[PDB]
Every structure is written in structure tokens, then in C-alpha cells.
Design a protein around this ligand. Structure first.
Ligand SMILES: [Zn+2]
Lengths: 50, 77, 180, 71, 112, 92, 91
RNA sequence: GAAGACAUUGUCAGGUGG
RNA sequence: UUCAAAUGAGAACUUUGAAGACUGAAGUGGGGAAAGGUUCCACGUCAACAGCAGUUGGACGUGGGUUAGUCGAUCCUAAGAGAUGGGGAAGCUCCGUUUCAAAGGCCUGACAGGCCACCAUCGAAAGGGAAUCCGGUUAAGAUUCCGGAACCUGGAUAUGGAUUCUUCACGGUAACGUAACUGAAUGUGGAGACGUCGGCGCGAGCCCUGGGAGGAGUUAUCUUUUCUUCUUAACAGCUUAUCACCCCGGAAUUGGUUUAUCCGGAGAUGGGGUCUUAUGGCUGGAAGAGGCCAGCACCUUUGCUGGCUCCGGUGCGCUUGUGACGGCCCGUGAAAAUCCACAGGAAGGAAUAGUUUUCAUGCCAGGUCGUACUGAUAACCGCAGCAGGUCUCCAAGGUGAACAGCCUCUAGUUGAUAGAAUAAUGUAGAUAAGGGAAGUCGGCAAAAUAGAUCCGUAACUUCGGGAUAAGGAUUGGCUCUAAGGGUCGGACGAUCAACUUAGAACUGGUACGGACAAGGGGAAUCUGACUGUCUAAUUAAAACAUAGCAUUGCGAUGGUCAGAAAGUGAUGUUGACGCAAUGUGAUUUAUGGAUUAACGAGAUUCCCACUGUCCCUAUCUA
RNA sequence: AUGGUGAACUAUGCCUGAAUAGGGUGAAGCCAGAGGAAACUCUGGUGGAGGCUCGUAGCGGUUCUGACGUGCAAAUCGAUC
């Protein structure tokens, strides 16, 4: 589109900063189950529906 | 930019308190069959509009370069 | 109704129309968007405020631009003009006539149509006039009517000979075409 | 940003989105004691803002860079 | 043959988004975005074109001085130089015919 | 360039190497307007010379719009015999 | 030259839509597109358009008329009876 | 201006009646 | 698709380099809209994904990156939706959009007088609209940045200039002009503001190319040769044009003029002149920049210096823009914001000094948001990286009618799992003697002529067509002839240049629209009048609409039609040549009768040639 | 049956924008000539209209009952019209 509204940019920021895998240092905490980031995303795989 | 035909018009544009800077250019062109003559181009930074003056003679150039004030900042080419 | 310039209306029954007349002037003659008849931008002088008041009359035949209209009640009987129907005798052909005084016209408006005064009831003022259909009807005199037929009689005689012309016709007024 | 610095007497700054050119032109002028020529601004995709600030002829960029601490 | 790109983001061949081509110093063609045409101003009475006036865009008239949007005589920047001539002598002759009706009405009321 | 030059010489133009119509190759309208917008100005530059009068220039306008004038040389022969019959009628 | 015998001016439509209709539309087509006499100029430079209108380029004046003619027989007879009745009622 | 104790509006009862 | 090198452990596949091919400019190119949203660029890296493999990648990790007074949105209003008033509705909320409203603001001028008239607001990143160009620059963006150079709006305020003691300039017959040359409330007018098609002119860009100067390449042999470069914006100053306009004077022996035939005593032709300034030209802008070359330095930060950067021509050429005309319609092909002017003249102001900030100079400021990327036989939608689909600009040369097809340059891919083998049969594509539709329900399919010119083309008809009718001949190359023109001089001549046609020879496979591209035709019968529309995803007609014909209803408290009810609502901004429902569908002569030219992916019979449909099957190619 | 959601595919009306070679035939009106007492009429050109016509892109899906149908495709491919 690229005549995109600010709020579209604003939700794109959230997706672009969510889409990182888990920082490794969390892997060693005490009583952690969270091994893989499961709410991770790609752009051709799943739409976000805006 | 704009062009000038009258030097008595010209010589106050260089004194009008907007100018800080101006310049001279020289040009190598040939008249009708003529002979290759240098051609002076006196240009001066009028802030709203650049004013130029095209001159073929060199003695007039030597005249005007000396006639102009010493404080004014000129460059060449 | 994109291009419809204005309703083919009359002036209102003001003091000038009711106790005298007024001179009003045509400026142009224009084809209406989707109408069998033409119209006329025609202008008057508003007598209460300083300006030229535009009006939109229907274009009877014979009328040209650069023309004046003395009009009201004390107007001479001439083509293009208007009167309430009491001052004229029987037989004066008119058009665009009113049902009630000041309704700015219901009857005798369509192209090449007219109506024909035949009678008067001067005491207890009315006026007898036939319709284009021919139904006789007697109406008050104070209501008005413009002299002459609506211009463009014989619009109906020409056939069309192809469907695209009818589509161009009925794109403009109403989607009542193609019909089953 | 280094190239812009050493080409334009220009600076870069990461900014709060609620601000505009005027506040930026004031704020750097207030803290860091320099005039400016003009400002230009964009919105980084991450939601942040960034502003490209042209100082004037009559100041410099690297001395003030060392003054502020970054390079 | 070099081929040319619209510089503005409207891709279409609209009335406004028009294209004149011009060759440049640096040796690559580009497109050049002409803007719409003027029109002759016109006569309120004649419907005719009137002379002396610069055909300019409507806000663009605000830059130029009084001369280019005007001529000298009365009814300067609106009228034909013949429609003025018609209406003036109309206003003179019927002004005289007002005196004609004056002498008529004073004659008949003198008779009364 | 060589193929073109042979076309200038008037080769590669036989019936075998023609696939389009006479209209698409050379339209009658452009031929007509070329000959006629030559003829008109020839008449005009004779008129200003006074070689032919206004009345004959006028009637030859319509007659030149019409055929009975094939091309330039033919109409100039018509001009010379027009001079001849002109001197004939004003003499006799 | 007169290039046909009876089809005349409406020959562009071709062999379609029937001769009885082609005759009437021809009769009206010659009437609409011809040039008519100006009341004021007295010139054959009066042309219609946007049906109902009639327009002289010479003197720029315009007038309403028939759909396909300057004026009707009804226009003639109402003109004549108005010439009568104005003089009758005024005096 | 038209119209005026009728119209009408609120509620009831006949004929007809996919 | 092929060969070598590098990488790395490992290469049918990555990268580079040498060849071969292709898209062949209505592209496998470069940009955009909607949509997508970090896919864009680097570095590192392969356990997954890329239906093979993978050292590669739109995949994985880490980061970098989107710069605006001028492009756009915002502003305008469009068909249209939608508040408040008010009224209904048990009620959620509804009808309505200026109307059963105390709707809002000023203008002097001593709290009193006076004027004005609307009605909200929302809705176009393709309509209207204030104003910008070039060059350079990055790993990635630029009308955004840098360097240079202009413009618009809104402010303040000094100067210059002009006008003035005749206060609101002068000139010119007039067209109108110049550097400006006051002016409110109110009024009027103009722009914005407007169709489709045709032909004609003009210019822009591109194409063809002459000469000159530079660089490259072929040169066994020929070619004063083949290819590329030689450019110049915004904006400002000066100048220039058709239509039209002004002065002179008065036309018949009627004249002027376009391609196209219209104009004139309502004043032509002609002489002279005014304006519009798209476009064109000169100069600045601007050579300093860019480009094409050479010579120098040097791991060099990487640089330095020289030159040249010129002058012409033609065209129905291609595309596009504009102009003056013409046709075109029962179609006549929008409104508003905004800007300007004009009439109007409240009032203000100089003589010892003012007035003019619509002339020139001069000063400060121009905010928010979008801006990368792809735009598709991998970046979107189709459950997917799917032989599908999605609006639009640029559009070269030969060829030839061409924007068909074939080939090529600019640019870009070389992607589609590969290798070795040729058994059938398949699928697509072809050829076959002799006969020539016998085969078969059925000329289903295949095949035949197809292009351009000369002659010629019947009956029948609604006279308009049928008609590319039928049918016969001709079609190559090389060298000639004739005709078809402009510009310059007073019967003609000198110079300048184009492909159009015709005509006569000579020649060879006696083949020549040689490829590619490209109608088979005709004799009878029936149906619907026709162009047209559809049962996508089993039916594309003898079904549907169509213009016509005739009938019927309605005169506004009306007809048709609708709502929860209303102070409701469409038709209706309408009014009987109208609004609406009917049977029926062109023509001759109303479950409708006899007839009918053209036309139909309509249905049937037959004639020509044509041919593997068949006797009778055989071979070859991917 | 009650209460809600849907016109991004598709049907229809609007509004505003945009797009569509090269050809064939040769309508009015006009020009010239000829005939005719006239009215009018024949020829040679001009002009470039026509829900005419061929043909591309574009739209559509007639047919082959073809490739393909455990398809690239939950409707494609090519050829045909
Ligand atoms: Zn007239």
C-alpha cells in the first residue's frame, strides 16, 4: 500500500518487535517450561489481518 | 536569474547590503568568424535572484574588478 | 437527476404580480437533462432588495433570447408572458398552468402540449379550460398560465430504430428500461 | 549517521513520537548550545522517531560529538 | 529509445497527471509534469473572448499586478469592447426616451 | 541502408512484394490534398502576379476543386491556352 | 451527383429497420439538420441542437422551436389568432 | 389563501376478499 | 544448456569469466494503484523450508535502512450517508437534513439606535486544487538528503521608484499599452466548469541521416565503411500565431476561402495595426555541471592535468499534447471550496511635504502523517513458493497494412530435478503411391483456396445489398524509361528531395504473397426480423430483450408503490407528445393470419474440388 | 421460530476517472461537366456518416465431447467459434 496510516505503522511495529525468538538467557532460569517461542510469526506463513 | 545591460544600474546591486558574495566566470567562445576571445561573466548573489553580467572585453573587466569594493568577497571560476 | 438545472417553475404571487406587473428578462435557453421540452433562465429585479433574482420558466415556442416579459396581472396579451386567467377572454391558448394559485404549475407542462380556455365564470371568479386529454375543468382565475404551447411539438413523431437510443433515453430519467 | 555527520555538520537523534520539529529545534538548542539551520524527521518502522538536524555554518559536529560523549 | 517513469505516484493518464518529455543535461530522459491549460476569460453579455488579459490559473492571478488582469477603460476586465458600446448607447437612448414619456405625460395631464 | 537505397532506386516494389492495399500504402486523400494544396497556392502566386484575373482565379477555384485538372504541368497547359483564348476573346 | 433513386439521405443505416420507418425518419432528418432563416439576420445560418433549440451563429441569437423544425403550423396559427385577439381585446 | 363541524383522528359493527 | 578457475570436505544446480539460446518492446524490462508488511541491504549460517541436492535464497540469527514549505492525504463538493430541531415509537432506536427554531455577528456611534440571512458536519491518495528543477550521493531511499539555482502563501516594515501644490498616472483614433498609479458594505460577471468521433494545421519526444571532431571493431579479400558520444531543466527577461478585434475605404464583370463550403453593406477582398504567448526562438540559468577521449601520478587517503563537448536536412514516419473546424444525439455530455476583476463610491488623505506596500529591492517562518520494497508462471488472492486472476504509463530498428507472427539492439532471465538409453502403445505434430467420403448414423476431425493487382461477378430484394460472390490471368531478381514536388528568377530556367504508380527489356528449377502469417465455395427447405443477453460448475436456442403497432387507466385530496407509526416516503427538480400495465414484435397485406431481402457459433438434403474416413496399412520427429 | 451478520466473488442503478490498431464498403452536403423549356436528371470527383463489415489486444466460453481430470487448476490447458 505505502500510503499507510499511522496506526497501521504502529501495529507493524508490534509485529516486527514480537518476531524475535527467545533470548537464550531465559533458557536456564529455575522452573522454566518456556522453551520455544510459540506465538512467533512469519509474513508469508500467517497473515495478521492487519 | 536575470541579465543586465546597464552598468550604472549594476553598480548598486553590488552595494545594496544584501550581497555578501559574488563571483567572476570566464568563457572561451568565437564570434561570427572572428577570433577566439575570452568572455567575462560577473555574477553576484542577490538573495532573491541571481544577477549576472556578460562581458566580452577584458579591459572593462580589469576596470570593474578595481572599481568594486575591497570588502566584497569574490571568487573565480 | 445529476444535470437537472432546476424545476420548471413560476414566480410567486407577490404584490407586483397581484396589483400590477413586472418586466423580466431572458438570458439564455437551455436543454434540460432528460426532458421532452426546453427551459429558460429568466431573471427579474427583486423589488425588496437590490439584486437580480433568477427564475426558471419553461420555454414556450416562439420565444427568443434577448426578450422581455411584462408579467403579473396588468400585462399585455403577448406570447411568452403570463397572467391570471381572468383578464383574458375565452380562447387564449396557454400552458404550464396552475391548479391552485401559487403552486407554480402542474398542468399543461409537457412538450408540445397546451390548454384552451373556453369559458369564464367572472362573478364568483373561475375560468373554464380544456386539458390536453380533453377533460374539462373549471378553476379559479387568480391562478396563472403562460401563453402559448410548450416548444418542441413533434418530438414524438420520430421513431428511434435501435435499442441504444432508447437506452440513452431511459438512462436519464429512471431505470424503467429494459421492460419485461 | 557518521557519514551524515562528516558530510553535513549534521546530527541524528532518537526522539519521542509526540514531539515535532519545533520542540526538537528548541531542545537541542537549549541543552547543547548550538544554532540550527533546519530539521527533517521520519518515523522509524519500530514506532520510534528520528530527526536529522543540520547545524549552521558557524558550529561544528565532532567537537560537540565528543562533548556529548558518543562518536 | 529510452523509456520514462512517471515521477508522481499517480500512474494513470488523467487530465491532470499529464506528461511532457524533456531531455536533460546529464543524458537521461525524464518525464515532466505539465499542468492544465488556461482559458480565455469571457464576456458576460457577449459570450465572447476579450483581449488584453493574461490567461492564467485562478489563484495564479493573485501574483500578477493590476495591468495584466485588466485594461484601462471602464468595464475593463470583464467585457468585450463592443458589448460595452452597445449597452452604453442603450442607456443613453432610453434615458432620452424617458424624457419623451415625460413630455407625453405632462402634455396629457396639462390637457386634463 | 542498401535495401532502402534499392527502394529509392525503385526496386523491391513489384506485385510480389506487396501485401497491403493501395489505401494503406498511399491514401487517396493524402494524394488529393497534396496535389490540391499545391494547385491552390500556384493559382495564388499567379493571382498576385496578375498573370490571371480575379474572376478567372475564382472560377478556376471551383474547376480545380473539380477534376479536368490532373496535375501541375497539365494545369499550366490550361493556363497557356487560357491566356490564348483570353487574348482571342478580347481581341475579336 | 444524385447517387441513389429513392433511399436518399438515410442510406447510412443501410438495409435495416424497414422502409416504412426509413421514410418517416428520412422526412424528419432532412428537416432537423438543414439551416433555416433567421428572423433577425434573414440568413440561412440557423442551426438546432439539443433538440428544441434553434440558433443563429450570425447575431448569436437562439430560439426554441419544434423538436425537428424552427416552427410548427400550430405556431403559425397561434401566432395569427394572437395577432387577432390582441387587437380585439386591447380595443 | 383554500377548507371547515363534513373531513379527519382514536375505537367499534355489515358486503367483498390467496 | 555447455567448458575452466575460486570457495569449500563435497558442486548437473552457488559466484565469476569464454561461448550458445531466449523474452524481442500490447516484454521474462523499468515504475505505480489495492493488498502484503521488513520480504528491501549487509554479515554469519544450514537442523528444518525452497516437493532433487544446495557452499545459494523472499528460508534461519544478528543488525542497518524509509528524511519533504513545493509529490500526496488534510481542504472542496459529487451520487450519497448523516447530527441538532421536532415528531413518532412500549422501546432498542426510528422519519427527516433546513424544515411548524428565540440556531448566529457584527459596523460605526452616544447602553442605545442600525444592517445582514446562511444553515451544520462527513465522503475522492484516479475528479477541482497555490507553488521546484538539475547534477551528485548510499549496501539500500530521493521532484524529500548534499551543492547550486527558482517559486507560492502568510506576515511585519525601511528604502527605491511612481502620483500629487490640478491630489487618486499618462499615452494611443481605436484594438490596447507601460514598472506602479487608493478604496469598504452591497451587487454583477469571469475562471475552477467539463462529452464522443472524424479529418486538417502547429509544435514536442523518438525514428532516417549529411558533414566535422573523438573512442571501439572487421579488414586473407572489398568497403572515403559498421557501432557508440557530441546533451542543456526549473524559472525569469525579450520576441513570435491562428481564431477573433480595431482604423481606411466601399465590393456585380459578384468576390474571399478550406482537404472537407461557408462568409460579406450587420461592411468583404486588400493596406496598416492590438491582443492571447500553449508552443517556438535568443540570452541568463550554465559549464563551473554532465558526457567522450587522451596523458599522468600510485599498495597509494586515491587523486592531478589536458583537450573536445560543432554545424545541418527531410518526412502523410510512430506515439502524445494543443489549436481551428465539422459531424454526432427524444443522449447536448456536473456542482462546490478558492482566486480575480468590474459597476458601485462609505472615507481617507499632500506643499512643505504626504500618499502609494496588487511595481522593484530588502527581513523572519512554513507544523502532523505516508514515502523502503514486490506488484507476480516465488514477493498479493486463490488452505501452497499452484501452468489460474488482479486496474495502469513508457513502447526502438528490419519485416510488413500493422500494436498480427518472425529476427534483433537497450535492459533481464538462462528459472521449470538431472543422467543413459529408442520396445511397443500413447500425447502433440507431419508425410504417404493408386483410387478419391466407397467408410461412417453423421464430409466429426484432417486437407483444400486464403495475401495484393487487372477484367468480371447472376437471380432475388425492404433497391440500401447480397459480394473477398462465382470465376480466369498475373506475383521473383537485375538494369532502364515516363509521370507525380518544394525553394530561388523575372516564355522557361538554377538549386533542393521524397517513395507511389505505370510502362519496356535481360535473366534462372520455370520457382517466385516462395518462409511466417492467411476465406473453401455453391444449389434447395424451415425457423427467429437484426447488433445484443444468459442456465459459471452437463443445455448459449426455434428461449429473453429490442424499436413498432393497438388497447386500457390517471387531471394532484390523482395513478403506481412503500413504511413500526408519524409533522412520513419514491416516481416527483414530474403533469396527458406525460406517468403506468397490457397483447405483440422489422416489412408487404394481436392463441394473431399468407409473404418476405440481409443476418444468425440456429436445424436438414445435395453439387464442385479437397483429401488416409476407408481398401491398407507404412514411416519419421520431441 | 427468535435475534444477529454479510454486496471484497456475482446481479442491478448511480457518481467520478481510464482504455479500445490496421483494414473493406463509400451516406448526406458540396465541386465540375453533360442533358433538359423547365422542373429536375446522368456522369467524374469530393467529403468520411453508418448500434455496416474483417481483424488484433479486450470481453465470452460455442464446440471438439481433445490434453488433463490419483489435474498446475475444488473449472486449468490448448484448438475452435
Ligand atoms: Zn441570427
Amino acid at each position: 500500500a505505502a500510503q499507510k496510516s499511522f496506526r497501521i505503522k504502529q501495529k507493524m511495529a508490534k509485529a516486527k518487535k514480537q518476531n524475535r525468538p527467545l533470548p537464550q538467557w531465559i533458557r536456564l532460569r529455575t522452573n522454566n517450561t518456556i522453551r520455544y517461542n510459540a506465538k512467533r510469526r512469519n509474513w508469508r506463513r500467517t497473515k495478521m489481518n492487519i | 536569474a536575470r541579465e543586465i545591460t546597464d552598468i550604472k544600474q549594476f553598480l548598486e546591486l553590488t552595494r545594496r547590503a544584501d550581497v555578501k558574495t559574488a563571483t567572476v566566470k570566464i568563457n572561451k567562445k568565437l564570434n561570427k568568424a572572428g577570433k577566439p576571445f575570452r568572455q567575462t561573466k560577473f555574477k553576484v548573489r542577490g538573495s532573491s535572484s541571481l544577477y549576472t553580467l556578460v562581458i566580452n572585453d577584458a579591459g572593462k573587466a580589469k576596470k570593474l574588478i578595481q572599481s568594486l569594493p575591497p570588502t566584497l568577497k569574490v571568487n573565480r571560476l | 437527476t445529476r444535470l437537472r438545472q432546476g424545476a420548471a417553475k413560476l414566480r410567486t404571487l407577490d404584490y407586483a404580480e397581484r396589483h400590477g406587473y413586472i418586466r423580466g428578462i431572458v438570458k439564455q435557453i437551455v436543454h434540460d437533462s432528460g426532458r421532452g421540452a426546453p427551459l429558460a433562465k429568466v431573471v427579474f429585479r427583486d423589488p425588496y432588495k437590490y439584486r437580480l433574482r433568477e427564475e426558471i420558466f419553461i420555454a414556450n415556442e416562439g420565444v427568443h433570447t434577448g426578450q422581455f416579459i411584462y408579467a403579473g396581472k396588468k400585462a399585455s396579451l403577448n406570447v411568452g408572458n403570463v397572467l391570471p386567467l381572468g383578464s383574458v377572454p375565452e380562447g387564449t391558448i396557454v400552458s404550464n398552468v396552475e391548479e391552485k394559485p401559487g403552486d407554480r404549475g402542474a398542468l399543461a407542462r409537457a412538450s408540445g402540449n397546451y390548454v384552451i380556455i373556453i369559458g369564464h365564470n367572472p362573478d364568483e371568479n373561475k375560468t373554464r379550460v380544456r386539458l390536453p386529454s380533453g377533460a374539462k375543468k373549471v378553476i379559479s382565475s387568480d391562478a396563472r398560465g403562460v401563453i402559448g404551447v410548450i416548444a418542441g411539438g413533434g418530438r414524438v413523431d420520430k421513431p428511434l430504430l435501435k435499442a441504444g437510443r432508447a437506452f440513452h433515453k431511459y438512462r436519464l430519467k429512471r431505470n424503467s428500461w429494459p421492460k419485461t | 549517521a557518521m557519514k551524515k555527520v562528516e558530510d553535513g555538520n549534521i546530527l541524528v537523534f532518537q526522539v519521542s513520537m509526540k514531539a515535532n520539529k519545533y520542540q526538537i529545534k528548541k531542545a537541542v538548542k537549549e541543552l547543547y548550545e548550538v544554532d540550527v539551520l533546519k530539521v527533517n524527521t521520519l518515523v522509524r518502522p519500530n514506532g520510534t522517531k528520528k530527526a536529522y538536524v543540520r547545524l549552521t555554518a558557524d558550529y561544528d559536529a565532532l567537537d560537540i560529538a565528543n562533548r556529548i560523549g558518543y562518536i | 529509445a529510452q523509456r520514462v517513469t512517471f515521477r508522481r505516484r499517480n500512474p494513470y493518464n488523467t487530465r491532470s497527471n499529464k506528461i511532457k518529455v524533456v531531455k536533460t543535461p546529464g543524458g537521461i530522459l525524464r518525464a515532466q509534469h505539465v499542468k492544465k491549460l488556461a482559458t480565455r476569460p469571457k464576456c458576460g453579455d457577449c459570450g465572447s473572448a476579450l483581449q488584453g488579459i493574461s490567461t492564467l490559473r485562478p489563484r495564479q492571478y493573485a501574483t500578477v499586478s493590476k495591468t495584466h488582469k485588466t485594461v484601462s477603460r471602464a468595464y475593463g476586465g470583464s467585457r468585450c469592447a463592443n458589448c460595452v458600446k452597445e449597452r452604453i448607447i442603450r442607456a443613453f437612448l432610453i434615458e432620452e426616451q424617458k424624457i419623451v414619456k415625460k413630455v407625453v405625460k405632462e402634455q396629457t395631464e396639462a390637457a386634463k | 541502408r542498401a535495401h532502402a537505397q534499392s527502394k529509392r532506386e525503385g526496386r523491391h516494389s513489384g506485385y510480389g512484394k506487396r501485401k497491403g492495399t493501395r489505401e494503406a500504402r498511399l491514401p487517396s486523400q493524402v494524394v488529393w490534398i497534396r496535389r490540391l494544396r499545391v494547385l491552390r497556392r500556384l493559382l495564388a502566386k499567379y493571382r498576385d502576379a496578375g498573370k490571371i484575373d480575379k474572376h478567372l482565379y475564382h472560377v478556376l477555384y471551383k474547376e480545380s476543386k473539380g477534376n479536368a485538372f490532373k496535375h501541375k504541368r497539365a494545369l499550366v497547359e490550361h493556363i497557356i491556352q487560357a491566356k490564348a483564348d483570353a487574348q482571342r476573346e478580347k481581341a475579336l | 451527383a444524385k447517387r441513389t433513386k429513392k433511399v436518399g439521405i438515410t442510406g447510412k443505416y443501410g438495409v435495416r429497420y424497414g422502409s416504412s420507418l426509413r421514410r418517416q425518419v428520412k422526412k424528419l432528418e432532412i428537416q432537423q439538420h438543414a439551416r433555416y432563416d433567421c428572423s433577425f439576420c434573414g440568413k440561412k445560418t440557423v442551426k438546432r441542437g439539443a433538440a428544441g433549440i434553434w440558433t443563429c451563429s450570425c447575431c448569436k441569437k437562439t430560439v426554441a422551436g419544434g423538436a425537428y423544425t424552427v416552427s410548427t403550423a400550430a405556431a403559425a396559427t397561434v401566432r395569427s389568432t394572437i395577432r387577432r385577439l390582441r387587437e380585439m381585446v386591447e380595443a
